[PDB]
């Protein structure tokens, strides 16, 4: 979290100085860490996304309906 504080502080100084989007090499340097950390944190900032949301604009498809389950078996494989 302290690292992430440093980054979401330093990124903004960066886009000031830049004035346009810091895709992670126009971000990484001033952060003081290489590209891969900024990128990794850019991935991990996804809190999960709550099945009970209506991905259908209508009350037609809560995400739970779309989910497929690839764990048990397929009967042709048993055969």
């Amino acid at each position: 979290i302290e690292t992430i504080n440093k980054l979401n502080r330093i990124s903004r100084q960066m886009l000031q100085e830049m004035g346009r989007e810091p895709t992670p090499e126009e971000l990484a340097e001033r952060m003081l860490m290489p590209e891969d950390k900024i990128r990794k944190v850019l991935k991990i900032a996804k809190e999960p996304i709550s099945m009970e949301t209506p991905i259908g604009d209508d009350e037609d498809s809560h995400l739970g309906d779309f989910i497929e389950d690839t764990t048990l078996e397929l009967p042709l494989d048993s055969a």
């Binding site: 886009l15 000031q16 590209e35």
Partner: protein
Amino acid sequence: YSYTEKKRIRKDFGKRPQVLDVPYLLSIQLDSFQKFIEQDPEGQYGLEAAFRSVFPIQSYSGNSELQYVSYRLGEPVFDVQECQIRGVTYSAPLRVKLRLVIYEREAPEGTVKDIKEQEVYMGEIPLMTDNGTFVINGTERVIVSQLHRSPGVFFDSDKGKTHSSGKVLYNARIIPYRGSWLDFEFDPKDNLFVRIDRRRKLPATIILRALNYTTEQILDLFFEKVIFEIRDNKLQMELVPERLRGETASFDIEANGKVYVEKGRRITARHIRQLEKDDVKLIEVPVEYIAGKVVAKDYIDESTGELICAANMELSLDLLAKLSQSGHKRIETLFTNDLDHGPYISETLRVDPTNDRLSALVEIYRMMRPGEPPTREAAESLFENLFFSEDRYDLSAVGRMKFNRSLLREEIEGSGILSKDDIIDVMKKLIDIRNGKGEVDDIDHLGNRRIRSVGEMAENQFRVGLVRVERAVKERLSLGDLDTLMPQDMINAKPISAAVKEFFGSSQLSQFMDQNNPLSEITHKRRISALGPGGLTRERAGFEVRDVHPTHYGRVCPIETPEGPNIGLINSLSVYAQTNEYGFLETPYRKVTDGVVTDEIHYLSAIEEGNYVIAQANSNLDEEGHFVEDLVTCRSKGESSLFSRDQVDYMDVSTQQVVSVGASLIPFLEHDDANRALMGANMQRQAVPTLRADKPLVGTGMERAVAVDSGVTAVAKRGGVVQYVDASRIVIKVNEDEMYPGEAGIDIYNLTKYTRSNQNTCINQMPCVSLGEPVERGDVLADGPSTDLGELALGQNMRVAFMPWNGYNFEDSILVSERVVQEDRFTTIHIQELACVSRDTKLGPEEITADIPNVGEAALSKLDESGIVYIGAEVTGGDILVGKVTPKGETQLTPEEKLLRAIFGEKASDVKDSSLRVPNGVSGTVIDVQVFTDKRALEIEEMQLKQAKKDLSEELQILEAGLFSRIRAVLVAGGVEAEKLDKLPRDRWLELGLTDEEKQNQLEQLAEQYDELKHEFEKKLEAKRRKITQGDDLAPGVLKIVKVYLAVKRRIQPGDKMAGRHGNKGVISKINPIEDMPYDENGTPVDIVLNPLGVPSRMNIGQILETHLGMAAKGIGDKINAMLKQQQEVAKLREFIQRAYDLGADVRQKVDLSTFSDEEVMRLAENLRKGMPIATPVFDGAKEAEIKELLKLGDLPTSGQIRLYDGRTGEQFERPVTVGYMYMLKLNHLVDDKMHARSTGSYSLVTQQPLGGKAQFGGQRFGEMEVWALEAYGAAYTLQEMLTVKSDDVNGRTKMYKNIVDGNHQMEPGMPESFNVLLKEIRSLGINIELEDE
């Protein structure tokens, strides 16, 4: 005419000589964002308004300060094109000049201390495309103009409960625009009660305790302020004539020396008249008269400071005398007499004694903050700051307006703020609406208020960013250094750009466009809603908001609105419509003066509309005279009836101004049905572009401006000779005298290509023209998906016959010859899309390569020598396009497979296959690949390099073989090596002719070309060769992305849904061989056969008229055909063609051909042969007489009824049949786009139950209806099969499955999981519930 309409005339049966030409709609956004951006010297708007509003910033002492100087925008770096591709903001930099002037505070305010004038970049701004689109992150995004709001009072009347009074009782309500609500209510005991937004019940009253009043002014609302003057003994007093309005004179209302109203006598209109006319409200009256009266206000003796009489207390004579002795010869009276003032506030005071404001404020707190302790600045700041502070009314200048505009304010704009004056004035206008006439807004009528229009929101989020700035600006100004602290060191480029990004790119009410049709996209642009924020909902709104209002005329098309839940809520805009400034709608209506229908036109609002009388444009004007007949069709009062001629105040402009554009396009609507015309108007927008462009023979006249205004135009360059000619490009060479010596002056133009639609259809443009012909400005230089020479093209023109046929046109179905698809003229295309995300894999990047063991990697074993890459690189369905591989983990090391990879032995890490392939059965066209950034590995990638270097070596050799002409020639200037130049090898010419000063410079310019060019090749080689040589190792998650799109085109077949332009649908059920079509003794068979089963019950007679007027048109087209094959002389072409143009009765529209030369008539006749159209304007349509004269001019039957021959036996049928040509429409509602049938799919999580939706392999859900039909039936087995196995149970389905393959189809019942779930659910509730397990 114009060349594009010379080259093809739409004959026009319109007569009604129109004063107006059709309007345009889009003016408000350009002006808004322009003024925001505009260099306003004096009248600031937006930007410079904001700047001069904020800067300069300083200390109050003067210690330091920054200065504003000016602003300038930068060029937006990339184009909107890359901003649509790349997934990028379209935006332009911002640059502001700022100076840091600073003062000596030692000297008083000596300014010469520091001056740092420099310019500051601070973020780009997204800008407006020429549509108004704002491309942000790959994406054009847009406003909706949204229709919403309403106050009022609405209460019933109860007659004379106090029968002595006989009074009407009505409660009363307020709606502030913003803030809290508040009601009266009268009860059965005749008492005025109140609820302050559902506060505790009190003596309070509505706006009055909102406005801090006691009983006197609660009474003063309806009644007024009489003043008693006791003149040295005697009472006198004064009046308003509209106080004593239908009231009883107890005594003699006389005057100075004249008697108005005697005793017991009511002050009739005669009495108020003479009471006004004689200039008297003055009279000598008895003092006792005051007995019964109520004092208006608290009165005292100033000597005392004692209430002689409190406010709202009945006056007398002992208080008369005391008031008068105290210093009141003026007794204002409020009036609680007895009769009509039923003692309501009195009984309330006898029930409740609170009569103070601070209790009003505490109770304000307490309703607002119930259970919370009232504190006075809390209750008061609550009461005020909530809905009168500028903070809350955020600042919105559409607000500012919206309140000006809900004020009846003339100031559109004003300040940047919404002064609470705007609030109370909007509220007072709104309560003046409700007390007056009950028309608050245009709720459902499409006259559009209050509509929040476009552009403005940019400024809202702009200034939000400005505040996001200004806080930190403060924190760093006051704290940090002042002298050494530049503005740009205080200026961050993030929030303003970040806002105008977020909002232009995140919204409701904005979504992808309906691209299938220029009609659909205009009427999508000419579309209105009653939904969204601040709007309605389908479940909350009813029928009143769905049916149409009599204001609709000239404002609302009642014919373009869906049939679903959106039936009346959704409804489209009419043709001649515009927008008033308050949002509202006004309407063209021809002024009628003296009955003479004046050609100037006034834009009447709907509230103006009803009070005036409007005549109809169907009216027979008497030739600049007036309405001819006594009974003009005019209209007012929300109802039509029959009135005189000079009485007209307006007439309608056109026979159109009610209609929308989509409804403008069916000819002969006047012979059509509202539901079927409604169905036609909807499916017209669902018509789909064909490959070719076939026009309508029958028009209404509106085809051209819609094909045009869905597009734009072009321009020219210097005089010259046309260099290169093309569908879309032209190159011109400028003349030598025009060519400046420095430039080459190869004036070149730009061009057009293919593209997909938002709805998976095709985009393109082609010419309707030639090169070396004059182009009148405003012409159409290139056609569209649905346009040709500048008119609409939704469908095709061809034969029709109306018959049953052997059950093939049983119910609404369609039959058709084989020959139409030999032409493919309905056959057409669907561009589809396919993709490859190549992402980061832990085991290593997915690499683009494909290596294969396992002998042949089979059936490749059985092939001929050739092999599925078979001759000429041929490839089947299923083959690979982009071979991507992904590194693979390891797996359990079983002896068999490990023996197999000891046989073949894929080296190590076993980079698993991920090739991008042709999915099964594809007959499309993998038309191109874009990408977004082992043995055959190296073959494919160095061969990709073979490909690419040959591409780009070509690119080189062309682009520099260009330049080698000038290199050579540059020697030949300054002498001539007239035969010394060429034959010796070309390079060794600089050693030829050379002279003094000015040539060696060009020997070296020449050498510089030799340098720069081979240098750039070295550059590009480096880049290109490495980028093909590199493996996939690109970016976070972007290892790379590869792209594909398809184009599926094949012949049409049963299931496709075809139709015309009157609701006349149809499903296909067979294609008919031509010999198996009806034919005639001419042997000429029918294209299609239709069932006339429904036209009486469909009542789409316009389709019939369409048909006849089409048959006659092929009548003229065949004449020109024969004149072509027979190759007529110029004279005859002239004769016949001018005979063709001037054919109609009194055609409004007129051309001569003697204007043109011969070859122009040749171009004219060589461009018309696909067809000339005709306009049947909608309600100014054709007549039976015209089409019949026209048809027999074709030598055809008058009614186009012709004996037809079957060819299954060759005979004649019994009766002749109607024959002629209709104009029909394809749709995106294709059996292609409809067919799927599938099997079980997925299951959910929390209930674990199977799927519905065919695309994802769905089973269909059932209601209780459908299981209970099975109960009625008796399939108890099948019921339990539909209770356990397929959805809830497991042992049932799997026992059943094992058994059916054992042949025994036996039943084992168990229990649905639903049941034990029920138990555990009701058992978490702590109740004993449990299974009775078998």
